[PDB]
Amino acid sequence: STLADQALHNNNVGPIIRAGDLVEPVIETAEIDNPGKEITVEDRRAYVRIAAEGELILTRKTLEEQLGRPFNMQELEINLASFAGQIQADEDQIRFYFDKTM
Amino acid sequence: STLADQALHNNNVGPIIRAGDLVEPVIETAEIDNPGKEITVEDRRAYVRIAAEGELILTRKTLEEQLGRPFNMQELEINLASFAGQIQADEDQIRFYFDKTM
Amino acid sequence: SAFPVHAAFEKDFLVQLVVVDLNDSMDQVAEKVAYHCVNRRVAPREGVMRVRKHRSTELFPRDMTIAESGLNPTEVIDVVFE
Amino acid sequence: SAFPVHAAFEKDFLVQLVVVDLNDSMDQVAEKVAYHCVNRRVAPREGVMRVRKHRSTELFPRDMTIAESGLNPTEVIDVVFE
Amino acid sequence: SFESKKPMRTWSHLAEMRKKPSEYDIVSRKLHYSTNNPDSPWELSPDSPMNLWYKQYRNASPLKHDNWDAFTDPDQLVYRTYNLMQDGQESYVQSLFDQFNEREHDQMVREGWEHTMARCYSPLRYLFHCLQMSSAYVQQMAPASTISNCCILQTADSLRWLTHTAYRTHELSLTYPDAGLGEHERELWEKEPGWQGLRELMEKQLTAFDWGEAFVSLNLVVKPMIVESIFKPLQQQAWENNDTLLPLLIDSQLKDAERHSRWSKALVKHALENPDNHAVIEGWIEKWRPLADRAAEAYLSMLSS
Amino acid sequence: SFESKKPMRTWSHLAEMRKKPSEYDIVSRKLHYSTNNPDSPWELSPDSPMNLWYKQYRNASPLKHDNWDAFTDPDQLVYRTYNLMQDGQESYVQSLFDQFNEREHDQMVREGWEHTMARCYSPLRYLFHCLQMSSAYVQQMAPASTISNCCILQTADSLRWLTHTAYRTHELSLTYPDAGLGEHERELWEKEPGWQGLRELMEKQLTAFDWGEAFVSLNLVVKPMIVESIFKPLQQQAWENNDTLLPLLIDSQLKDAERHSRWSKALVKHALENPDNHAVIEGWIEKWRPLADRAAEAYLSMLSS
């Protein structure tokens, strides 16, 4: 249960983005909007698991810039296949985050 | 020029439909809406060349039935990649046809 | 006289429905179970097959019949080697 | 003294720009053209290379120079075997 | 032995249609497995709570037909085509909202109209939500998937109307912040006489658990009353008070309402294949009409005050 | 030798942007190769007819800038996003047409309004088509693809307005078949005094072949006049004659018109990086304003008769 313990004791939060035109822009956005956080990316081809420690923010303004076309925050749902963390979403950004620290 | 002569001396008319959800319904429609005409079909994978002698009609009513969902004639353009024959189109059908007989 | 039990054979992967007879010996029951196991998912081996209530420490005598054993139908047994 | 012509070599697939010299012989011109053809797209062969105006029936003498031939620059010639 | 059979062109249950199965047929028909086993609707203990609930409120309904599954939405809507249609309608409503707000429509309504809206319009969110809840109940209890599908869309349509009402309540409050818009709707729904007939009607309707009675009361009695006694009088009042947005919005909502009536009528026609069902349906209408009539009278009395 | 270079993240011409190139940047920028070679715009004889045409009417324009390509549509529209926006607007207009026709709007306009429409509204198809033709000319002559793109969309928008007008002319004729709707528009355009200022204006504008003068006359003089002297007075007249559809339709067309003005203004701002261009632009406005003013006066005189 060492393996299982270690797996459980993580604070990774962030979007799982399905294969498509949002993958690269969301990775770039995670990097830009969370400076001083390391962004991790696990590529499973059909989806990409993007994470930071404790909290990861995606702003609409930055995603729109990285995507290269007009973008409303609600459209992220088209490609947000899952996520780690609790979610706090509005017209301006989405925040993935944990209340606890494991 | 025998080969070329023979190729030129045809009266084949009808739609060339690009690969997609219209291929089978258009073939079925050509058969149903032109009884007593033989419908030929050449499958090039990315497109299908569908033809009859002298004239080939596709009615909106029949295409809608074979397609299985509500359909307006103008939507055929989405998948009509080319056609042989002159074209006469309206809200109710499209007619592919030749004035001359070679 | 049909008597259904559920049987787990030593080194197999599952429990199966095996219908034995009320008057079968614990040598015969072990045969009827083996038929569905040995040479199918279990390698054959030397030794004497024995019957016991599931995960029991007690083995039934080889000569004892199921009727004499006090087993109830649909109860679970194991077939194992001495 | 540079003299551009366009040359078609027997059994090649194209015409190429070959710059010869105003005082080259029809034996030398044939060499300068061959350099761009034989062992590249044309198998080498026995025989004497000759020069003629494109699709002409008349061959130029082997010793004649381009200046003496009356060819104009950028005109088309063939290089062929007797 | 078994027999050998070749592949079928469609689902085994549709394989004997004369016609080529449509998108609607393929994805809508005969999906309630819970009707397969009369003793055990659900794959659990036959006397589990939900199994008893379904045996009482679906299987035992006096409204009876031996082939409910044969029912067909006359519109033959599927999820895909519903969204195409409603994105069309909502984009149109959004365009209206945006352009009327640009023109400051709300400022030019007849003096006092804001008070009429605060009293007679904004608490509609409660009524529409009741329709939403009730539609969902018919969905979960109906004995055929083609029926439940019409109910799913109707539940969504009910939330659509609720949402319009919420949006406009807030917007109107921006121009008229002293009329209790977005503030006093719950109290009005609970205490205002004009609303009490409707509230009593819906509370009682929401406790009609037989699937057949739920459908009839909701779709044949309550909903038609709302059309004739709420939607249309509101359009007339708006006209009289220089509200030009509300009639257009209501026209779009009425498209939904006529659609609900269309499928409802088609379900009635199917049911009436069993002549016994006429008295059953007629009996339920006679039962609920009085409550419906009293609800409309009180509301209209309030509206025209 | 050459040098070795690694792959670039975008087109070589965009590779020195600070920002990640947008969809707009990628598909819109620096696509006119015909501006590369001043002596031979097109890959033909340098003195071919079209090469002479372009050297005279584009290259030699007094309106001058050393980097027209740097121009940016302030809306940054591409084909894809234009269609999304306009399908939105046209679906909305279609919804309006359908619902107003359902309500028999046309029957309830003020007596005689049909005659005002037949005279002042329906022949707009000629004016809008002139805008369409003229927009296409600026497209083909503009010295940057980002400029031409705004012109392509404006050409489409012009046909959009033309099409609205055709549809409504026919529809109105169904209720008023004795007003010459759809019958006498060409004669009106050709002979009616109210239309002659506009016709003279457009015939002359369509023969301004310098790309710079074409743009200025069309987008800075003609089009703003149409907004202030045609579209808005029509909305006012409609209001006075109980036509509630026309103001809504015109509001949608005005969205297009403001967009044309937006990019036009942005092109002016770009051009004015060259201080010489102020007098050039100002000179062309002063040249065409009188014709534009006379066109509006005649039209307004006709409208208010």
Partner: protein, 491 residues
Amino acid sequence: AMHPRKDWYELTRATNWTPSYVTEEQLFPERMSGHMGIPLEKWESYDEPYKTSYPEYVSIQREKDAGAYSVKAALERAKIYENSDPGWISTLKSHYGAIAVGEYAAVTGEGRMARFSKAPGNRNMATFGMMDELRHGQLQLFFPHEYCKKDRQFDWAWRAYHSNEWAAIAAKHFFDDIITGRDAISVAIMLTFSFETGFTNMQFLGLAADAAEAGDYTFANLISSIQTDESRHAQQGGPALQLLIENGKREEAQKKVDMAIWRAWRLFAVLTGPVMDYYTPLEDRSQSFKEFMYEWIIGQFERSLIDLGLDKPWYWDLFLKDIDELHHSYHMGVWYWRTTAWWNPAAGVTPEERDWLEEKYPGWNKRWGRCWDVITENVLNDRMDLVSPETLPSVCNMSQIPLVGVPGDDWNIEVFSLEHNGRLYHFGSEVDRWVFQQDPVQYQNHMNIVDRFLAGQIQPMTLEGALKYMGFQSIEEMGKDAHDFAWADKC
């Protein structure tokens, strides 16, 4: 201008009122609502964290489908069915049969909440949930439909849930328990929280990774799009759980989660486990089943469960051992009894695959490998009669899946039995027995397929009789070895 959603959203969910003409309990009966006596006013603090509104929903969902359908259309001629490994085709058959009509059933769970939850936000989000599951059911009938004309097993995308086939019964017993068979609050906890943020990621995203590796973009694109809906409506669970905990019902909440997670686990172990470690071609195994479990269930789901303030399940250590072991046995059994399935299981034990298994599950060869050795030897000697069973497996009275254990060198198998109301039940785990004991009225009179066989309900009482009872209508429909034993040529 338009006004932003945050300014008017509260009014969309200001829909609770104090009933006067019927009682609160009449309007929200506990058997359907499951409010646990918590007063209406307390439910108004419910705050759905993943919001949407009707106009946004129809527009966004329109766009989701346009892409799903466009991709399917553009790839019709990609030769997936014709050129795919048959193990991959069986994966499709299994998925669509086990899922399509269960998705449509999920509409009813959402409907139960839309009518019966006391929380206004829950009733609105459940309305979108109803729409979502409608989408999912319709997509997953529409997509396999074109394959009917190729293979009668694809008929099961529609037929499965109408059948008494053993896997269909296991699916229905589970979904009827967590989705359609309980009160609205239980649905919120067991379905939207436990199943939908817990396990479905395995089948709709884990499997999508394998699908992309196998070059089946129609399917990978489809299921990943579906999961974007799941991600939204699944967020109805967390706020209900938080509300329960705040109102003194933590123990009740924990129990519901504990039950739902184990129930989902056993089903996923029998269907997804074999897909990921055996049917999916080796070169297409993005990760092992266990690896995906550790990513999705342990790393993501359990961590989220702890963040909300619940505890690891009491059966934690049993669950971890089960992840190492259970699906290997389930796979072995599904394949040996392949004829009772509506897909063609692949054995997946070529030498190359057994090396992968040994690497992913040290000790595999000395356990399951022992049974596969016997099976393989028979195959190589054309002793095919020994490769097909002549009796029924014993079945769990909870999961409806056969009773299994670890075979081979360290043989260990345990059945957990129970006498109750004069009847003898058998369970495949401690947890399955515990689940039964949590709510006996839900289960006590249910009879599993083998109970029925022994009780005379399956006539004739034979293997053939059982196959007919399970709804197989032709010989072609019954499961066979995916490669017609061609794999033995590698042994």
